[PDB]
From Swiss-Prot, chain A:
GO BP field: defense response to virus
Keywords of this entry: Antiviral defense, ATP-binding, Endonuclease, Exonuclease, Hydrolase, Nuclease, Nucleotide-binding, Transferase
Cysteines joined through disulfide linkages: none
Record family assignment: Belongs to the CRISPR-associated Cas10/Csm1 family.
EC number(s) per entry: 3.1.-.-, 2.7.7.-
Activity modulation comment: ssDNase activity is inhibited by EDTA.
SUPFAM superfamilies xrefs: HD-domain/PDEase-like
Name this protein carries in UniProt: CRISPR system single-strand-specific deoxyribonuclease Cas10/Csm1 (subtype III-A)
Written domain comment of the UniProt record: The N-terminal HD domain has ssDNase activity. The C-terminal GGDEF domain has the cOA synthesis activity.
UniProtKB/Swiss-Prot annotation, chain C:
GO BP, sorted A to Z: defense response to virus
Protein name: CRISPR system Cms protein Csm4
Source organism superkingdom: Archaea
Quaternary structure and interacting proteins, as annotated: Probably part of the Csm effector complex, that includes Cas10, Csm2, Csm3, Csm4, Csm5 and mature crRNA. Interacts with Cas10 (csm1).
InterPro entries: Csm4
Additional comment: Encoded in a type III-A CRISPR locus.
Function: CRISPR (clustered regularly interspaced short palindromic repeat) is an adaptive immune system that provides protection against mobile genetic elements (viruses, transposable elements and conjugative plasmids). CRISPR clusters contain spacers, sequences complementary to antecedent mobile elements, and target invading nucleic acids. CRISPR clusters are transcribed and processed into CRISPR RNA (crRNA).
GO MF term set: RNA binding
Keywords: Antiviral defense, RNA-binding
Family recorded in the similarity comment: Belongs to the CRISPR-associated Csm4 family.
Length: 772, 277, 279
């Protein structure tokens, strides 16, 4: 309609840049994209490709001259083939023009690629998406050969012909190829070409809704006036929601919760987009229970956003007894508030006006309830044995494991979903009173779209792929990515706790790790435009979504190198990715491959970013007979142990320390990986066995960890210096441990731990990998 | 209702080193999470006095049908071979796999001489315990020897030997160093003055069995021989708790042994209590 | 504001820091033993009029800790570096010196070490005939050598010495909840006087579970429910310690539970004055 034709008008405007870097026509890519969309309307084409060439032609302001050139060209062209008004087609040219400036900011040279968002000095070699067989490492800068841009266009020439000319179908095509293409060729441009066309479409759809006309865009009134409205929400209480279940539902159930949370995350965002008239371009990001939507400032929409929020929260109060809360806040901004003005970042302080409204709302945790502090004593409630929710009696139904226990109804939907995870290809968003819906959200119901099956519903969430394979033409395609690796059992299903640790290296134990990127909220305030923040929140998004799968599959030896590894990486590793959000991850697995993975995730993350952001992984080691609500409790505290100290450091093993404060526990990343290079290849050979003539001396390495326990009762004593030298003497092993036999006078004056303090964690990993 | 609290104090003398363990040296003893001194749990000493008094009744389920009711409803033995709660046999509570004597209600637990004292949950009833077995920590003489450089644990390596080929298969066990002193405290609650008497006779009977048996650990390989040295008997009456004015009945047992306290001194030392009840 | 502090020096390891409602149910079950039945309902009418207690809070060798108010979070940026804005917000307790500063919205300091350590001890269940194991986990608060737990009292001293000081001598020999047959909740008691200066303003932090009648200003919510004589109590929406009300007296809700007597749940607020930012 008149609505959607302005939506694609901003989206298909800067096309012509990818045909410019080839050089199919002359310069001035507005003239190129006019010809590139004219000839597509000729063969295998609709009628709008002639009319969507208008939008690519008249932007950058070199083409709207005296408001007079625009008319005579479109005087011949016919808007009555769909019913567009002569002036209302002229209106959509100005709206795309202003949104083309708003997403950009203050802004050709040669043909420089996408300079990387973490190091703007480095750049990306051009590549495709789908996160398979490729890790985009920002390398040295190389300006792209123009022969590469020819096959990009011809492939894009074919993909635009197949796909339905529609707003939700051109987005997964332009995201497929133009993700790694720089928009404006300049020095250190870290703004991608997909996002610069996406936010151009996103703002133009809001300017149509705000109510501005062509001459109002021409006047300076449309900018410098409060017409945009930054919606932002956040789930507060995620870690208190997923992990607080008792010793039931081993890992088919946790893996079901972490995707159930993502359904609620999309059931609100897609509710805001339909109710306000917005497409999926208006989402800036959505990862990890935290989204941000750009919308219009009408009186009409703010009436709707209070209805969305009050209906979400009252759902999140009955279904979960205040364990999860969705705090939605919005704030009106002006047009000039996006780009930087002078030297002051307006978009950061406009985000601080919005993030503070989050911080107050997370305090008033359930304010819009009014039956919150009301007391009514209902007869005979009881609580669930799995998740611990209080229900009235009779609603507790028998489970899918045993008919003896009387679990929640909402747990049996999450055990049945816990089996349908391998047999899955997406979700379908549909009405509440439908047949076949497992789980209900705060606005809709989600049908499983199985392996063999047909999709049902009006909107279809599709996991981990951007191509509408078996999807009908009428439906909306909403692609979500999720970190989804799991070791399959002998059946066709998801592994158990008690399967992963039987197949581990050495003794049996469950290796939980939970790590997160540090100083990331300070990193997203560095961005100063919606083009720039949508990119940085998407490249950071795709590491823990897509490229963490390719690490566990066993790839990228050139990028990673050698890690502290008890045995070389198997073909099918036994790793269960429970959750991985974008800032955060929580991965369980075989406890001596989770040890190998943490140094393999950190190493690949340090080359995905250009050496600028770091991880803090908190490793734990727990038995199979351990409830998960304690495993997440101890590991998150081992996380905050490794967080408050240096933010660039790994916890490895539960380790005893003196009460002085000089001795901090968790290892620095680089400091640990040399303690593996020295200590491990001289006392350990590989695959759970020891070096030559050190067997029948596994009593020694316990005695060597007894002398570390004399350093802890008395750090000032030098009793550990000669006991180190003697015990290596009697056993004939005078060559091993030369760093421990002598005191370090350099370490005394630095007030750092002695080298007998660091040896505990490097010995235990070698010791626990043998049966001990 | 409530009448007073007979507080027993004294010393536990682990004559032979004892071991408890945490399952995390292959079998380490429990210690404090901060100081590192080992101790005896209150549970490892309430449950151990429960097992030893359970078996003695198990032999006398016939002869105690006139002194105690609710033993006519029992027959000696376990209920493991048929997974049937509150059957005719005695140990009728399956916790996870262990079958333990726990009475199911109140009015049978009030007469049963174990569940009256040590306490029993059951369904719909929950008769709470009557004793409070407080933890035991090392005597300040031994807390100071911890500071005087002495080691309070020691590893014993035991071995397991093939019968024919005489191979060696060792293992380690971290025990508490033998000769130590733990100071214990067992706080009885006087709920009913009718069976006031027997709970102090049936608790000191379980200590006569614990002194001959072991206290946790390997035990039959020698790691028990716990010995009780009493220091103070008290009463702490209901007059004491209302005002705090120190007029509690005290019985002196400073050099009294646990078989010299059951009948040698039990009419003697608790003579002063019987007038106050 | 001179508060009768009640120090609880622990013997064995506590099951939890006692909540304010764990204490008042423990105190009421004491007075039903050492004073009969009619004195407990007389005790309930005394707390209705003026008397208030607080939740229990830890102490570490006279260094008395107190809950951090939620008054500091909406304008912690107006206080003071981003690393400091998180580690100051992440905290849960403040010292007696530093709790007074955040009532006036001054810059302040968190404590460095927490006194207690929530450790989990594994226990076992053994059958009597075959000595066959049956493990189950268990977890409790383990306090240090000097440290312990205390709570506050403000009200008429003839209600203190008549009611509480008997009850805290009876509760030294039967525990404050938990498996108090394993010597868990036991302690010894000493009483003291303790002074907190409150700036006069109409907003107030609550040092106990609030259970409000009108909606508060800024509140960290809490769901807990007790167990009176084997009967489960329904989960109630208390507010955690350190939330901000304006002129709210709190309340107590009697509950049925099918007992011979009615059962009250202490939720009377414990207001100390606070200065709020703009919102
Ligand atoms: Zn449930
Ligand atoms: Zn019994």
């Amino acid at each position: 309609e008149i609505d959607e034709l302005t939506a694609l008008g901003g989206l298909l405007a800067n096309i012509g840049k990818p045909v410019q870097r080839a050089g199919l026509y002359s310069g001035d890519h507005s003239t190129q994209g006019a010809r590139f969309l004219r000839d597509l309307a000729e063969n295998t084409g609709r009628a709008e490709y002639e009319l969507l060439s208008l939008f690519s032609e008249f932007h950058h302001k070199g083409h709207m001259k005296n408001d007079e050139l625009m008319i005579r060209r479109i005087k011949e062209l016919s808007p009555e083939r769909f019913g567009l008004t002569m002036e209302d087609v002229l209106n959509a040219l100005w709206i795309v023009y202003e949104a083309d400036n708003l997403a950009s900011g203050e802004r050709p040279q040669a043909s420089r690629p996408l300079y990387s968002v973490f190091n703007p000095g480095k750049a990306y070699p051009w590549a495709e998406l789908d996160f398979e067989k490729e890790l985009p490492v920002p390398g040295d800068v190389f300006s792209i050969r123009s022969q590469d841009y020819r096959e990009l266009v011809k492939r894009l020439w074919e993909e635009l012909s197949k796909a339905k000319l529609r707003s939700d179908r051109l987005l997964p095509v332009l995201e497929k190829y133009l993700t790694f293409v720089s928009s404006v060729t300049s020095e250190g441009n870290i703004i991608s070409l997909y996002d610069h066309m996406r936010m151009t479409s996103a703002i133009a759809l809001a300017m149509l809704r705000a109510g501005c006309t062509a001459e109002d865009v021409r006047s300076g009134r449309c900018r410098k006036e409060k017409r945009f409205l930054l919606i932002e929400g956040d789930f507060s209480g995620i870690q208190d929601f997923i992990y607080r279940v008792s010793g039931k539902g081993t890992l088919k159930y946790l893996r079901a919760r972490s995707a159930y949370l993502e359904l609620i995350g999309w059931d609100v965002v897609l509710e805001i987009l339909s109710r306000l008239g917005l497409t999926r371009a208006n989402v800036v990001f959505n990862a990890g229970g935290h989204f941000m939507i750009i919308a219009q400032n009408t009186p009409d929409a703010v009436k709707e956003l209070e209805e969305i929020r009050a209906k979400a929260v009252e759902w999140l109060y009955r279904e979960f007894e205040s364990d999860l809360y969705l705090a939605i806040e919005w704030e009106p901004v002006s047009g000039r508030e996006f780009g930087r003005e002078g030297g002051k970042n307006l978009f950061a302080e406009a985000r601080k006006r919005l993030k503070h409204k989050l911080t107050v709302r997370k305090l008033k945790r359930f304010g819009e309830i009014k039956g919150l502090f009301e007391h009514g004593h209902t007869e005979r409630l009881a609580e669930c044995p799995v998740c611990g929710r209080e229900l009235p009696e009779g609603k507790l139904e028998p489970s899918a494991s045993d008919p003896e226990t009387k679990v929640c109804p909402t747990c049996n939907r999450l055990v049945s979903l816990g089996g349908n995870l391998p047999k899955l290809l997406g979700f379908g968003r549909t009405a509440k009173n439908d047949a076949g819906v497992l789980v209900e959200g705060p606005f809709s119901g989600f049908v499983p779209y199985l392996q063999g099956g047909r999709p049902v519903g009006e909107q279809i969430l599709v996991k981990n792929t951007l191509n509408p394979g078996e999807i009908p033409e009428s439906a909306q395609f909403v692609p979500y990515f999720v970190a989804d690796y799991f070791k399959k059992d002998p059946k066709g299903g998801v592994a158990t706790f008690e399967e992963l640790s039987m197949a581990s290296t050495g003794t049996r134990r469950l290796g939980v790790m939970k790590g997160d990127v540090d100083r990331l909220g300070e990193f997203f305030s560095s961005m100063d435009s919606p083009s720039k923040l949508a990119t940085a929140s998407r490249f950071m998004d795709y590491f823990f979504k897509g490229y963490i799968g390719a690490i566990i599959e066993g790839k990228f030896g050139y990028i990673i190198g050698d890690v502290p590894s008890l045995r070389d990486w198997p073909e099918e590793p036994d790793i269960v990715v429970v959750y991985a959000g974008g800032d955060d991850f929580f991965i369980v697995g075989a406890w001596d491959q989770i040890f190998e993975l943490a140094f393999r995730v950190r190493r690949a993350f340090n080359a995905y970013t250009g050496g600028k952001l770091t991880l803090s992984v908190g490793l734990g080691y727990f038995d199979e007979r351990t409830p998960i609500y304690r495993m997440a409790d101890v590991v998150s505290e081992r996380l905050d142990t490794a967080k408050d100290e240096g933010r660039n450091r790994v916890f490895v093993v539960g380790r005893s320390r003196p009460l002085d404060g000089k001795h901090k526990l968790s290892y620095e990343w680089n400091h640990y990986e040399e303690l593996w290079r020295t200590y491990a290849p001289r006392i350990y050979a590989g695959n759970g066995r020891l070096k030559g003539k050190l067997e029948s001396k596994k009593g020694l390495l316990w005695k060597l960890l007894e002398i570390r326990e004399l350093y802890v009762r008395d750090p000032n004593d030098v009793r550990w210096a000669y006991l180190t030298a003697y015990l290596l003497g009697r056993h004939g092993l005078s060559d091993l441990f030369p760093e421990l036999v002598g005191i370090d006078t350099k370490a005394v004056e630095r007030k750092e731990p002695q080298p007998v303090y660091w040896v505990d964690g490097v010995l235990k990993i070698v010791l626990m990998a043998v049966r001990r | 209702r409530f009448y007073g609290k007979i507080v027993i104090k004294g010393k536990i003398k682990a004559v032979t080193g004892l071991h408890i363990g945490s399952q995390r040296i292959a079998n380490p003893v429990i210690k404090d999470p901060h100081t590192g001194l080992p101790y005896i749990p209150g549970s490892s000493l309430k449950g151990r006095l429960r097992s030893l008094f359970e078996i003695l009744v198990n032999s006398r389920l016939g002869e105690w049908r006139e002194k105690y009711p609710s033993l006519a409803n029992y027959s000696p033995g376990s209920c493991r071979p048929d997974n049937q709660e509150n059957c005719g046999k005695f140990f009728n509570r399956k916790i996870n796999r262990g079958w333990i004597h726990v009475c199911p209600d109140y009015e049978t637990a009030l007469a049963c001489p174990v569940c009256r004292l040590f306490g029993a949950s059951g369904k719909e009833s929950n008769f709470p315990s009557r004793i409070i077995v407080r933890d035991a920590f090392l005597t300040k003489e031994w807390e100071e020897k911890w500071r005087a450089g002495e080691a309070i644990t020691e590893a014993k390596i035991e071995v397991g030997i093939d019968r024919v080929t005489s191979q060696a298969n060792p293992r380690t066990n971290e025990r508490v160093v033998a000769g130590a002193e733990f100071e214990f405290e067992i706080i009885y609650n006087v709920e009913n003055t009718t069976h006031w008497r027997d709970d102090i006779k049936n608790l000191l009977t379980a200590m006569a069995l614990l002194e001959d048996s072991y206290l946790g650990g390997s035990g039959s390989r020698g790691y028990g021989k716990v010995k009780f040295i009493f220091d103070s008997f008290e009463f702490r009456p209901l007059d004491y708790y209302r005002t705090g004015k120190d007029e509690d009945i005290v019985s002196i047992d400073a050099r009294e042994k646990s078989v010299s306290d059951i009948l040698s001194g039990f009419d003697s030392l608790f003579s002063e209590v019987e007038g106050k009840l | 504001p001179k508060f009768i502090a009640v120090k609880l020096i622990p013997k064995g390891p506590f099951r939890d820091i006692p909540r304010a409602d764990t204490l008042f149910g423990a105190i009421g079950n004491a007075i039903s033993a050492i004073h009969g039945q009619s004195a407990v309902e007389e005790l309930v009418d005394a707390f209705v009029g003026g008397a208030r207690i607080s939740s229990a809070f830890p102490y570490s060798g006279d260094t008395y800790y107190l809950p951090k108010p939620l008054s500091v979070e909406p304008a912690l940026e107006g206080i003071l570096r981003y690393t400091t804005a998180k580690r100051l917000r992440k905290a849960k307790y403040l010292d007696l010196k530093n709790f007074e500063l955040a009532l006036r919205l001054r810059p302040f300091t968190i404590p460095e070490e927490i006194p207690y350590a929530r450790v989990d001890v594994p226990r076992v269940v053994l059958d009597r005939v075959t000595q066959d194991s049956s493990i189950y986990f268990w977890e409790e608060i383990r306090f240090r050598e000097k440290s312990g737990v205390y709570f506050l009292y403000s009200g008429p001293r003839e209600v203190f010495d008549g009611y509480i000081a008997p009850a805290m001598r009876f509760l030294g020999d039967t525990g404050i909840g938990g498996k108090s047959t394993w010597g868990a909740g036991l302690f010894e008691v000493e009483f003291h006087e303790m002074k907190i200066d409150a700036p006069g303003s109409e907003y107030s932090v609550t040092l106990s579970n609030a259970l409000p009648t009108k909606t508060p200003v800024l509140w960290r919510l809490l769901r807990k429910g007790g167990w009176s004589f084997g009967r489960r109590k329904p989960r109630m929406t208390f507010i955690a310690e350190g939330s901000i009300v304006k002129n709210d007296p709190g309340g107590m809700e009697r509950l049925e539970l099918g007992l011979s007597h009615e059962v009250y749940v202490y939720g009377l607020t414990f207001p100390l004055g606070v200065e709020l930012p703009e919102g």
